[PDB]
Each structure stands twice: as C-alpha cells, then as structure tokens.
Amino acid sequence: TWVTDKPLTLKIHMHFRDKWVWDENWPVAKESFRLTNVKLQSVANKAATNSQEQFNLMMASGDLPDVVGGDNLKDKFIQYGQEGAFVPLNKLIDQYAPHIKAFFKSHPEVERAIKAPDGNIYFIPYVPDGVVARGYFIREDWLKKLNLKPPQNIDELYTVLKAFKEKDPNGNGKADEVPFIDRHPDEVFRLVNFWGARSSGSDNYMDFYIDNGRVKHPWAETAFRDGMKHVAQWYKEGLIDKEIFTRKAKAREQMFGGNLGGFTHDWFASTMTFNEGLAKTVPGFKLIPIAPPTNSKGQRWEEDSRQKVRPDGWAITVKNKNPVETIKFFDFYFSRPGRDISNFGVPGVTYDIKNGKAVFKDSVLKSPQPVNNQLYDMGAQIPIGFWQDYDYERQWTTPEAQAGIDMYVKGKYVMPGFEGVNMTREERAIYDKYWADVRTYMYEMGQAWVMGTKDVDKTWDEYQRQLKLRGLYQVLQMMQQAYDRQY
Numbered sequence: 001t002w003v004t005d006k007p008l009t010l011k012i013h014m015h016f017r018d019k020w021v022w023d024e025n026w027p028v029a030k031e032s033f034r035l036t037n038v039k040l041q042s043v044a045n046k047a048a049t050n051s052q053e054q055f056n057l058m059m060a061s062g063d064l065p066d067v068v069g070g071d072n073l074k075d076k077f078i079q080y081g082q083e084g085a086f087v088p089l090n091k092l093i094d095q096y097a098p099h100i101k102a103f104f105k106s107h108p109e110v111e112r113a114i115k116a117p118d119g120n121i122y123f124i125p126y127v128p129d130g131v132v133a134r135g136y137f138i139r140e141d142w143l144k145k146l147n148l149k150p151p152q153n154i155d156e157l158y159t160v161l162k163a164f165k166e167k168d169p170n171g172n173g174k175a176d177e178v179p180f181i182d183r184h185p186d187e188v189f190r191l192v193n194f195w196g197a198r199s200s201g202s203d204n205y206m207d208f209y210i211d212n213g214r215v216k217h218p219w220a221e222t223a224f225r226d227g228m229k230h231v232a233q234w235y236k237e238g239l240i241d242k243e244i245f246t247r248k249a250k251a252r253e254q255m256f257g258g259n260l261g262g263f264t265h266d267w268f269a270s271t272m273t274f275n276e277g278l279a280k281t282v283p284g285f286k287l288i289p290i291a292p293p294t295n296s297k298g299q300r301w302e303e304d305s306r307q308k309v310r311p312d313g314w315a316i317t318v319k320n321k322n323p324v325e326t327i328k329f330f331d332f333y334f335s336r337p338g339r340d341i342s343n344f345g346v347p348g349v350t351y352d353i354k355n356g357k358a359v360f361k362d363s364v365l366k367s368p369q370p371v372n373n374q375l376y377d378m379g380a381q382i383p384i385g386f387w388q389d390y391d392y393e394r395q396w397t398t399p400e401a402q403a404g405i406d407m408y409v410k411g412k413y414v415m416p417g418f419e420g421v422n423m424t425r426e427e428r429a430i431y432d433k434y435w436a437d438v439r440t441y442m443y444e445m446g447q448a449w450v451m452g453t454k455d456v457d458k459t460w461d462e463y464q465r466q467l468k469l470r471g472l473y474q475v476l477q478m479m480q481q482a483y484d485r486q487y
C-alpha cells in the first residue's frame with residue numbers, strides 16, 4: 001500500500017470536535033505512515049477549545065499547511081476552495097485516486113452533495129455507514145423502583161421525568177436526580193419534537209429542511225417558538241440538566257456513572273454499553289431504548305438519522321508541493337486496508353483479519369468505554385476523509401441495542417434527512433455572507449430561551465426582525481431558488 005518511494009512528511013491542520021488534533025504518533029497514524037509511507041505532522045493548537053475558530057484563525061494568518069481537516073468544514077472547503085486556498089481534486093481523483101473514483105461511481109449523490117458551485121471537488125469527505133443514529137433511552141431500573149411504566153406520550157414523559165426528579169429513585173434521600181441529560185447540548189432544542197416542532201432537517205444540528213417543497217429553517221417557525229415555551233418550563237422545573245450547555249462530552253460518564261440521570265437522546269451503540277460498563281459501580285443500572293413518546297400532535301418523531309455523507313473531511317492546500325502523492329494518500333482511506341485501520345485501529349492491537357475481514361477482539365469489546373471512544377484516542381473513527389464500515393459498529397452493538405434499532409426501523413420513526421441543495425455561485429455567496437452569522441445568533445437566543453434569560457413569546461417578534469435584518473430570509477430565498485431548479 002505504499003504511495004511514495006521516499007517518506008513524505010506533510011503539515012496538517014486538523015482541529016475537530018473542540019477537543020482533538022491530529023497526532024503523528026497515534027497508533028493508527030503510526031500505522032498509516034507505515035502502510036502509506038506518508039507522515040502527517042500537526043501544526044494545530046493542542047490547547048485550543050474551538051475547532052471552527054482554529055480553522056478561521058489559520059485562514060487569517062495566511063500561513064497554510066499541506067492538508068486541512070476536520071468536522072463541519074464543508075462550507076469553508078467550498079468557499080475558500082473557490083477562492084483558491086484549496087485545490088480542486090477532480091483531475092487528481094480521476095487520474096490517481098481509483099478507490100475514490102469507484103466510490104463516487106457507485107455513490108453519485110455523495111459526489112454531488114460535496115461539490116462546489118464551480119463543479120469542483122475541494123475535499124474528501126467522511127462517509128458514515130449505518131441507517132439510524134440517535135434514539136431515546138430511559139432508566140428502566142428507576143421505572144421499576146418507582147412502579148412506573150415507560151412513557152407512551154409527552155404527557156406520560158412529563159409525569160415520568162417529574163417522578164425521577166421528586167421521588168428519589170436512587171434512594172439516598174437527596175433530590176439529586178437529573179431527569180434529562182445529554183452529552184450534546186443541542187439535544188435540548190430537539191426536545192421541541194415532543195410538541196410537534198422540528199429542530200433540524202438532519203443529523204446536523206440547526207439544519208434546514210424541506211416542508212412540502214418549501215425550504216424552511218426550523219428555528220424560524222412559530223412551531224419552534226411554541227415548543228421552546230415548554231422546553232423552557234422543563235428547564236425551570238429542573239427536569240433538564242442545569243449544566244446542559246456546559247457539561248458536554250462526558251455527560252454520560254458523569255450523570256449515568258454518578259447515578260443522577262434518568263433519560264437521554266443519544267446513539268444506540270455507545271449509550272447501551274453503559275449497562276455493562278456501570279454494572280458494578282451502579283448495581284442494577286439498566287437503560288432501555290423506547291419508542292419516541294407520542295408528541296402533542298399525535299405522532300412519534302425520530303428526527304435524527306445517519307447521514308449519507310458528513311460535512312467533514314480533509315483538503316489539499318495550494319501550498320502542498322506534493323498533490324499527487326497526497327491524493328494517493330487520500331485514496332488509501334477508501335481502499336480496504338485504509339478502511340481497516342481508519343475503522344478498526346491497528347492489527348494485532350485492536351483487531352485481526354479473520355476470514356477476510358477485520359475482527360476486534362475482547363479487551364476492546366468489554367471495556368466500560370464505548371469502542372469508538374477507544375478508537376478516537378488512537379486515531380481511528382476520526383473525521384478525515386475515510387469510508388466508515390458499519391461492520392465495525394455491529395461488532396459492539398449489544399442485542400438490547402439491536403432490538404432498539406429494529407424497533408425504530410420497523411416503527412418508521414426516523415424522519416428522512418435533508419440532502420442539501422446545489423446553489424449557483426451567486427446563491428451560495430449570499431449563503432456564505434449570512435448563514436454562519438444567523439446560525440450563531442440563533443443559538444445564543446435559544447440558549448437564552450431554554451435557560452430563562454429571555455422569554456420566547458416576549459422576544460419572538462424582535463427575534464424575527466433580527467432574522468430578517470441579518471439575512472435569514474434572503475438565504476432561504478436563495479436555497480428555495482436552487483431547490484426549484486431541482487423541483
């Protein structure tokens with residue numbers, strides 16, 4: 001699998017998920033270098049805590065590396081690619097990247113989704129593998145202790161969460177229970193689904209969506225305002241983690257491991273590992289998947305789904321003096337041996353090739369830490385350009401977790417996600433000038449609403465004014481225009 005005759009050292013700026021950078025001595029990166037003869041060296045800031053700021057600051061310094069990578073960079077790969085900071089990959093892929101060329105061959109909608117208005121491919125994306133993403137999970141051992149049954153609608157959800165709060169299910173005499181926790185703060189806004197309001201059109205938070213041939217953004221609709229009215233009341237009543245916006249990554253380890261949380265919306269595989277992982281420290285701990293409790297409008301909504309392609313990956317800068325070797329290095333991660341390490345880690349360390357496929361073995365499968373959390377720490381399952389393989393995830397999907405997935409599929413609960421729109425140069429330019437600005441202001445207002453710093457009703461009108469003056473509806477007009485060119 002070597003691509004270059006002499007070892008090639010490339011500078012990567014890859015800051016992702018507000019917590020991590022590329023490591024040259026990751027066991028997977030050490031194995032990457034070993035298989036490809038291409039070494040990557042991180043120039044990103046270790047200690048920094050905002051991946052988008054780091055990309056921006058890097059762009060602002062004029063000092064680019066050879067490779068830029070990370071999560072949530074699709075819009076910037078496209079915008080700065082058109083400006084000439086990243087090179088178009090079309091001819092390189094066609095001539096030097098066969099596995100990628102074969103992937104786009106059998107995945108034409110992926111290649112279309114990641115392209116720029118000028119028709120150029122400016123990064124290689126992270127391609128997820130799977131169907132469902134998040135579901136709802138509740139403490140059945142608390143339900144049992146309190147003599148409750150799983151909630152079937154929002155009315156019963158409220159009653160059950162109230163009981164977790166008020167009737168001491170951990171039995172320590174203290175009102176320490178925190179009914180709803182989530183390691184992703186944006187899930188608190190997705191709670192508006194339970195009153196029949198969208199929070200996002202996709203697995204990307206605050207995403208647009210299509211409603212009957214009309215592009216909308218969910219946080220602009222009156223339905224969102226009404227939903228936030230109940231969400232704010234829940235926060236006020238202490239049903240939602242007071243620290244929901246600041247606890248973040250390790251909220252499961254903290255709130256479940258400390259026997260404080262009763263309820264969450266998270267991924268099936270990893271969340272269900274905690275039953276085993278906490279089996280000794282919290283005797284009797286048992287999370288179960290439940291169907292989405294029927295919302296106030298009489299429907300069961302699972303808004304989240306696995307994406308066909310995520311807005312993450314890596315790109316080749318103009319400064320890169322070895323574009324050919326780099327694109328071959330990219331191609332490695334769409335080949336079977338690249339998929340092997342990027343999904344499974346290091347052979348003889350986390351997996352072996354058994355019957356022609358990577359099979360994990362048992363030190364990893366039984367860790368109290370979910371398998372994908374272990375793989376991050378060694379450089380696998382990271383948002384480079386690589387073709388994820390659901391076989392890696394099936395191997396640590398417990399039977400109880402699998403029964404949840406099957407329930408959600410059978411039940412039809414998973415709403416189809418927004419696949420995107422193909423804008424023109426002018427349309428996407430308006431999108432570039434306004435959306436990030438609008439998205440930030442939206443988040444700050446909702447955090448305010450959830451926490452009770454501002455009232456939803458009393459600020460809704462001035463909110464809609466800001467939406468209009470900051471260009472939200474002009475962005476919508478341009479997306480609709482591009483949607484109409486497809487419909």
Ligand SMILES: O=C(O)[C@H]1O[C@@H](O[C@H]2[C@H](O)[C@H](O)[C@H](O[C@H]3[C@H](O)[C@H](O)[C@H](O[C@H]4[C@H](O)[C@H](O)[C@H](O[C@H]5[C@H](O)[C@H](O)[C@H](O)O[C@@H]5C(=O)O)O[C@@H]4C(=O)O)O[C@@H]3C(=O)O)O[C@@H]2C(=O)O)[C@@H](O)[C@@H](O)[C@@H]1O
Nearest residue numbers: 017018052071205267268269270271372381393439440443
């Ligand atoms: O666990 C399993 O069962 C399965 O997990 C699968 O991997 C999932 C993980 O479970 C998580 O879902 C992971 O979430 C990532 C996500 O991909 C994004 O990278 C997201 O990006 C957020 C940024 O890190 C940052 O927090 C950002 O802050 C915003 C802020 O929200 C607000 O907008 C403000 O105005 O602006 C800031 C800003 O950036 O300036 O928010 C981003 C966002 O909006 O969410 O970060 C999370 C994360 O966990 O950190 O995604 C992976 C995945 O691969 O998709 C998978 O491994 C599967 O196989 C497992 O079975």
Ligand SMILES: [Ca+2]
Nearest residue numbers: 130131306308
């Ligand atoms: Ca899929």
Ligand SMILES: [Ca+2]
Nearest residue numbers: 168170174176
């Ligand atoms: Ca208690």
Ligand SMILES: [Ca+2]
Nearest residue numbers: 432433434437
């Ligand atoms: Ca602007």
